[PDB]
Amino acid sequence: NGHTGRKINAQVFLGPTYYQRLKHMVDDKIHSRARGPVQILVRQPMEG
DNA sequence: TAACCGCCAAGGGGATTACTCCCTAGTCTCCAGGCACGTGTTTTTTTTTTTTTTTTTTTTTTTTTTTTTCCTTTTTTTTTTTTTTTT
């Protein structure tokens, strides 16, 4: 255990694998909006 | 070789005369099928509404989110200014 130091009762499977990162970061996907631009036709919020 | 003619012989039935009889010509008189007139009830034609399939039209196709790229005219005709040549 990390917090207490006790042995884990169930033995665990460990070893090196090969992992790949993906381009879907949260910095490129977070979005928030309170009030902003409106359309010139329907006065609705933007896209994207 | 038997048609035809001449001669002879025989017989069969149509013509003739008379008697009869019976069936039809003629004339009333009653009445009934034959026929003139009217029309029908099936037959064909025409509408009428439906039926049944084919064809055409129209509308539809789960939602949300994030990046680029290209384009957002173009040739073709008409006009208008400019430049060069000539008298």
Strand B: list positions under 7 Å from protein Cβ.
65-67
- Nucleotide nearest A46 (Cα, C1'): B65
**Both tokens of residue A45?**
């919020």
Q: Are A45 and A36 in contact (CB under 8 A)?
A: yes
* A28: CB within 7 A of chain B nucleic strand: yes
The answer to whether strand B lies under 7 Å from the CB of residue A31 is yes
Q: Residue A5: which region, alpha, beta or left (left: phi > 0; alpha: psi -120 to 50)?
A: left
CA end-to-end span of chain A: 45
| Solved with | cryo-EM
Q: Which residue is listed with tokens 């006790």? A: A6
- 3-state percent breakdown (helix, strand, coil) of chain A, nearest 5: 0, 0, 100
| Residues A40, A37: Cα–Cα separation, whole Å | 9
The structure was resolved to a resolution in Å of 7.8
Q: Beta carbon of A27 within 7 Å of strand B? A: no
